[PDB]
Design a protein around this ligand. Structure first.
Ligand SMILES: O=[N+]([O-])c1ccc(O)c(O)c1
Ligand SMILES: O=[N+]([O-])c1ccc(O)c(O)c1
Ligand SMILES: O=[N+]([O-])c1ccc(O)c(O)c1
Ligand SMILES: O=[N+]([O-])c1ccc(O)c(O)c1
Ligand SMILES: O=C(O)CNC(=O)C(=O)O
Ligand code: NI
Ligand SMILES: [Zn+2]
Length: 328
């Protein structure tokens, strides 16, 4: 078996290998990449997402989110307080202000230490889930707005045509902005391109050990667990690498830099934080191997977890019992 220790693998496709997206994902999996739950892909040197990032300041962040923490330094929840709209130019200026800017630090490790020590004492503002794309329309390779759709994948594999669309989302981050422990909707893949700015650190649990993380989460967030059988779908729970280690949860970490892609694999729990002002673009996608994960994906129906219009059809076709119950 390839990659039995479930290490995060890093790939350097040639420009020829970068043409066929589906084929390269399949290649990565043939090398065991999916066992980690996360892979890094460094594009060939000949490739670029767009010419420049010079004219992005007038993009609007309609609903910036202030991420307010509760709990302990290594075990906390965050809730998102809505703030007034601001442009990306205004957001960048805010990110670089004394209140919000990245502190002096020696290296990524020092910054990671500072993050877990001090995150709960601040409330950074995140511009998340902004529908849009920063890929040039002429970028033909790994353009996250030109991928085959999940709806077409389902149709190709299962022969059923369904409604729905899926399009990319932009994320504008600043120091300490945080993404909570989660898998994707319907345990889909995701792909994430860091367009510009400071790095993003990722933590990931191998899919074969995802239930170990769930069990720990139930212990660490007992009220949340009682409220919903799939409360990690709420995207509110953070657990530090120190606490994971103390509880013997298998995981890995890696830092993504500007110009790099990350792929998360079905049922790969992940969490992380931004180092400073940056912009990422991400989208969910599927492969034939995803279908069985989609069938088995847990669902939130306590009401908390927000779900796209397109996720309806996935549940309807792949989990008809759960769909029928959700109706009545
Ligand atoms: O940027 N890419 O991905 C490229 C650039 C040139 C090529 O000839 C190619 O096959 C891929
Ligand atoms: O703020 N809360 O609700 C919290 C904070 C930490 C926890 O471990 C928790 O179960 C709930
Ligand atoms: O709050 N902490 O630091 C904690 C809480 C629970 C744990 O099991 C742990 O190893 C650390
Ligand atoms: O455990 N699962 O994954 C299940 C259990 C029942 C279902 O009806 C389902 O669609 C998935
Ligand atoms: O970048 C973020 O804030 C969160 N991204 C993801 O969870 C992802 O790409 O799957
Ligand atoms: Ni994700
Ligand atoms: Zn719920």
């Amino acid at each position: 078996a390839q990659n039995p220790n479930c290490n995060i693998m890093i790939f350097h496709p040639t420009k020829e290998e970068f043409n066929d997206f589906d084929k390269y994902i399949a290649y990565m999996e043939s090398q065991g990449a999916h066992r980690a739950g996360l892979a890094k892909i460094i594009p060939p040197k000949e490739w670029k997402a767009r010419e420049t990032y010079d004219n992005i300041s007038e993009i609007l962040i309609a609903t910036p989110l202030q991420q307010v923490a509760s709990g302990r330094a290594g075990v906390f929840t965050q809730y998102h307080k809505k703030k007034k709209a601001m442009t990306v130019g205004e957001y960048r200026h805010l990110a670089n202000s004394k209140k919000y800017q990245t502190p002096p630090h020696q290296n990524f490790e020092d910054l990671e230490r500072k993050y877990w020590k001090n995150r709960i004492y601040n409330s950074p503002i995140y511009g998340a889930d902004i529908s849009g794309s920063l890929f040039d329309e002429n970028t033909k390779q790994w353009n996250l707005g030109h991928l085959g759709t999940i709806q077409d994948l389902l149709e190709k594999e299962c022969g059923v045509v369904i409604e729905g669309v899926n399009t990319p989302y932009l994320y504008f981050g600043m120091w300490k902005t945080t993404f909570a422990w989660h898998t994707e909707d319907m345990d889909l893949y995701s792909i994430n391109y860091l367009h510009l700015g400071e790095p993003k650190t990722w933590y990931v649990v191998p899919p074969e050990h995802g239930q170990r993380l769930e069990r720990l989460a139930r212990e660490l967030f007992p009220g949340s667990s009682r409220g919903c059988g799939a409360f990690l779908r709420h995207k509110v729970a953070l657990i530090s690498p120190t606490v994971l280690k103390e509880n013997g949860i298998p995981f890995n970490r890696i830092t993504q830099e500007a110009g790099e892609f990350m792929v998360t694999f079905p049922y790969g729990y992940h969490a992380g934080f931004n180092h400073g002002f940056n912009c990422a673009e991400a989208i969910n996608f599927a492969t034939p191997r995803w279908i069985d994960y989609g069938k088995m994906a847990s669902q939130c129906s306590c009401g908390e977890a927000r779900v796209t219009f397109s996720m309806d059809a996935f549940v309807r076709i792949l989990q008809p019992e759960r769909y029928d119950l959700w109706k009545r």
